[PDB]
Amino acid sequence: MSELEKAMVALIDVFHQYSGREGDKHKLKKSELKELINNELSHFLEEIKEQEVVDKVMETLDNDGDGECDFQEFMAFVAMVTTACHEFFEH
Amino acid sequence: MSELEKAMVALIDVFHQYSGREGDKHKLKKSELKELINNELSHFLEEIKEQEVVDKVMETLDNDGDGECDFQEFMAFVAMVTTACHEFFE
Ligand SMILES: Clc1ccc(-c2noc([C@@H]3CCCNC3)n2)cc1
Ligand SMILES: Clc1ccc(-c2noc([C@@H]3CCCNC3)n2)cc1
Ligand SMILES: [Ca+2]
Ligand SMILES: [Ca+2]
Ligand SMILES: [Ca+2]
Ligand SMILES: [Ca+2]
């Protein structure tokens, strides 16, 4: 696959790694999302060490209001970290 | 670096590859967008060989109507292809 195709497949794969852990296998619960961030974005975001921060990220990301992060809502978080990293550097 | 972190980087890196060819270094014009789809999404989307298709895709992606695809707009594109792929893990 190209460098873009591989990247797209990795987003799918990572969302599935964390979402199939508990309950709804195709949505991220608070605990799943915290592990995803803490394990998989250590060089991009501060580790979450507080409940308040898990709560807040979920509230930001939860657009349909079910209290979970689904794949659409995950791709939106991906855009805002990727944009953050882009915003960061002068290119 | 994690797989996700690498995937995020590759997204910036492929955007920059194609956006820095012609004109505005930061933006994808139609011809840069068409070569990006055709060279880098060959396994996902149909090869573009019709101007009409170049135009429709750009019209679809361009939300500020400056006729180019900037980084935010390329991200919405990424998410829509990824989703039309995810529907395959259905
Ligand atoms: Cl769309 C979006 C989603 C999440 C964030 C976000 N959620 O947390 C943080 C930082 C990372 C490390 C913990 N503190 C805040 N950023 C920003 C935009
Ligand atoms: Cl923003 C965006 C991104 C990708 C598409 C797209 N590229 O191909 C398809 C079709 C429809 C969905 C599933 N089959 C391919 N859709 C449309 C808009
Ligand atoms: Ca789950
Ligand atoms: Ca939700
Ligand atoms: Ca350009
Ligand atoms: Ca634009």
Q: Does CATH place domain A1-91 in 3.30.930.10?
A: no
A 29-68 → B contacts, CB under 8 A: 36, 39-44
How far is ligand 6, taken at its centre, from the CA of residue B83, in Å? Answer: 21
| Dihedral in degrees, nearest 10, Cα atoms B80, B82, B87, B88 | 140
A19: which 2 tokens?
Answer: 């979402």
Q: What share of chain B is helix, strand, coil (3-state, %, to 5)?
A: 60, 0, 35
- The domain ranges of chain B are 1-90
**CATH of region B1-90:** 1.10.238.10
Helices (H), chain A: 3-19, 30-40, 51-61, 71-88
Query: What are all long-range contacts of A71-78, with beta carbons under 8 Å and residues at least 24 apart?
Result: A71/A15, A71/A19, A71/A26, A71/B83, A71/B86, A72/B79, A72/B83, A74/A11, A74/A15, A74/A28, A75/A11, A75/B78, A75/B79, A75/B82, A75/B83, A76/B79, A78/A11, A78/B8, A78/B79
Judged by DSSP in three states, B43 sits in coil
User: Helix (H) and strand (E) counts for chain B?
Assistant: 4, 0
Contact A39, B2 (CB under 8 A): yes
CB contact under 8 A, A40 and B3: yes
Distance from CA of B52 to the nearest CA of A (A): 24
Answer whether B83 touches A (CB < 8 Å).
Answer: yes
User: What is the structure's resolution, reported in angstroms to one decimal?
Assistant: 2.0
Could you identify the residue written with the tokens 């919405």? Answer: B76
How far is it, in rounded angstroms, from Cα A26 to Cα B6? 23
